[PDB]
Amino acid sequence: AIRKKLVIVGDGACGKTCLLIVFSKDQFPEVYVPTVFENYVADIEVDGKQVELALWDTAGQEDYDRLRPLSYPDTDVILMCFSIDSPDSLENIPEKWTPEVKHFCPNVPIILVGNKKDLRNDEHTRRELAKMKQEPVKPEEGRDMANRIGAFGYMECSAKTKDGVREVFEMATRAALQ
Amino acid sequence: SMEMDEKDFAADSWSLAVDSSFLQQHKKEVMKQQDVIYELIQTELHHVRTLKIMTRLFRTGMLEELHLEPGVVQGLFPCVDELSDIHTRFLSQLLERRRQALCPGSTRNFVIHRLGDLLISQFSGPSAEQMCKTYSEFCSRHSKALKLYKELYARDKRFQQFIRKVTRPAVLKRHGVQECILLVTQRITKYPLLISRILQHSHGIEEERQDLTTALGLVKELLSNVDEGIYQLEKGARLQEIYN
Numbered sequence: 036a037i038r039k040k041l042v043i044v045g046d047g048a049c050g051k052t053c054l055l056i057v058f059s060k061d062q063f064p065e066v067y068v069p070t071v072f073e074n075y076v077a078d079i080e081v082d083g084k085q086v087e088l089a090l091w092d093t094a095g096q097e098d099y100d101r102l103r104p105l106s107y108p109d110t111d112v113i114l115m116c117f118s119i120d121s122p123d124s125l126e127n128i129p130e131k132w133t134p135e136v137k138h139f140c141p142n143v144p145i146i147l148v149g150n151k152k153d154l155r156n157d158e159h160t161r162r163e164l165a166k167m168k169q170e171p172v173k174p175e176e177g178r179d180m181a182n183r184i185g186a187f188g189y190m191e192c193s194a195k196t197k198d199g200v201r202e203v204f205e206m207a208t209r210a211a212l213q
Numbered sequence: 214s215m216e217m218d219e220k221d222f223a224a225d226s227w228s229l230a231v232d233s234s235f236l237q238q239h240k241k242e243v244m245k246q247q248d249v250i251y252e253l254i255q256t257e258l259h260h261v262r263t264l265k266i267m268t269r270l271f272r273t274g275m276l277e278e279l280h281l282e283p284g285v286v287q288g289l290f291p292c293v294d295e296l297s298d299i300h301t302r303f304l305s306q307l308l309e310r311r312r313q314a315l316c317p318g319s320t321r322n323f324v325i326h327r328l329g330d331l332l333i334s335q336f337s338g339p340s341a342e343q344m345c346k347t348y349s350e351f352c353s354r355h356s357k358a359l360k361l362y363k364e365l366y367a368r369d370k371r372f373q374q375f376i377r378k379v380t381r382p383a384v385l386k387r388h389g390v391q392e393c394i395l396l397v398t399q400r401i402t403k404y405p406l407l408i409s410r411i412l413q414h415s416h417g418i419e420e421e422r423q424d425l426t427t428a429l430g431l432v433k434e435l436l437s438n439v440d441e442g443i444y445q446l447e448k449g450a451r452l453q454e455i456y457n
């Protein structure tokens with residue numbers, strides 16, 4: 036098995052920690068959802084190839100511009116996250132996260148991931164967003180942003196229901212192998 | 214880690230660690246507060262363990278089996294003795310606070326009502342200055358340590374066999390040399406996340422909400438200072454590159 040490194044980046048409310056926790060445990064915790072994620076080395080087999088995929092979170096590093104880049108050395112794939120219930124987290128993707136990741140991780144594939152896709156058809160979410168002249172991020176808005184920033188691809192998932200979670204990490208492993 | 218502390222923090226939460234007949238006697242808000250305090254102590258136990266792998270397994274193993282130059286080993290593991298001292302002392306205080314809170318006749322049933330005072334002490338005065346200086350030095354030497362590791366693994370056969378040998382056990386799967394270094398660098402930015410969530414469930418006693426609010430402010434001040442004090446060192450950097 037070859038060793039590959041994955042780092043997840045994105046704003047504080049994007050759900051990156053929950054996404055890593057659910058994948059590494061293969062479950063949405065029923066008793067206690069951890070506040071933080073240390074690291075994890077996933078044994079993944081994708082398209083006939085065995086990979087050890089080391090997983091890292093940047094949560095807590097969002098306000099610290101000189102500590103945060105220390106998470107980037109030798110990264111093989113970036114998951115760039117936004118929350119579908121937060122159109123503001125999508126707007127920070129092109130002019131904050133993308134120039135940073137292209138600078139410290141040149142030539143590393145970026146997968147743009149829309150998290151919390153279950154909230155797209157949630158009544159409370161739609162009501163709260165409508166009070167600020169907003170609506171949940173549409174699938175075409177996610178794809179267009181991914182296309183614009185030169186992302187390897189665009190994917191959606193829900194850490195709450197686990198839908199799309201396995202596919203995101205299997206595709207990330209394939210991106211790290213290219 | 215030692216067996217006693219490992220078993221005390223083996224459960225996924227405080228609600229699963231204590232006896233269910235003890236859990237039943239508490240309100241949901243106390244349970245939510247205790248689950249986050251348990252995660253803070255559990256992750257501190259794991260962080261101290263990461264520092265022991267770096268000092269005892271890697272650093273001392275290299276000095277004893279490879280007879281490598283002490284200046285090379287220091288470049289691979291900067292400040293590990295100072296970091297171990299700071300966090301082992303902090304962990305000792307957290308574990309003693311839990312131990313004092315145990316019910317008589319129990320080694321697992323406890324409620325920690327007064328964490329804020331301990332966090333204020335850790336993140337203020339001389340201990341905070343020492344944490345600031347040590348992480349400023351560590352995080353400034355982080356990239357250099359990784360490049361030194363990668364050079365040694367590629368060109369030195371006995372070093373490669375040493376690493377492959379000591380990292381073969383399954384319990385070391387997430388704890389290679391580079392992984393330990395990033396785990397230590399990322400530790401300090403976990404504290405505001407843990408403290409903010411403990412604070413969210415600590416409004417019942419006004420003295421405690423105030424202490425946790427002060428602790429949260431001290432941790433953020435420390436982090437801002439560490440972040441401002443970082444300048445990445447590079448082996449073979451020239452003075453001209455530095456002053457430009």
Ligand SMILES: NC(=O)c1ccnc(NC2CCCC2)c1
Nearest residue numbers: 058059060061077078079080201
């Ligand atoms: N295609 C795979 O091999 C695969 C699929 C889903 N999850 C995987 N990871 C593990 C790590 C912890 C939970 C399961 C691996």
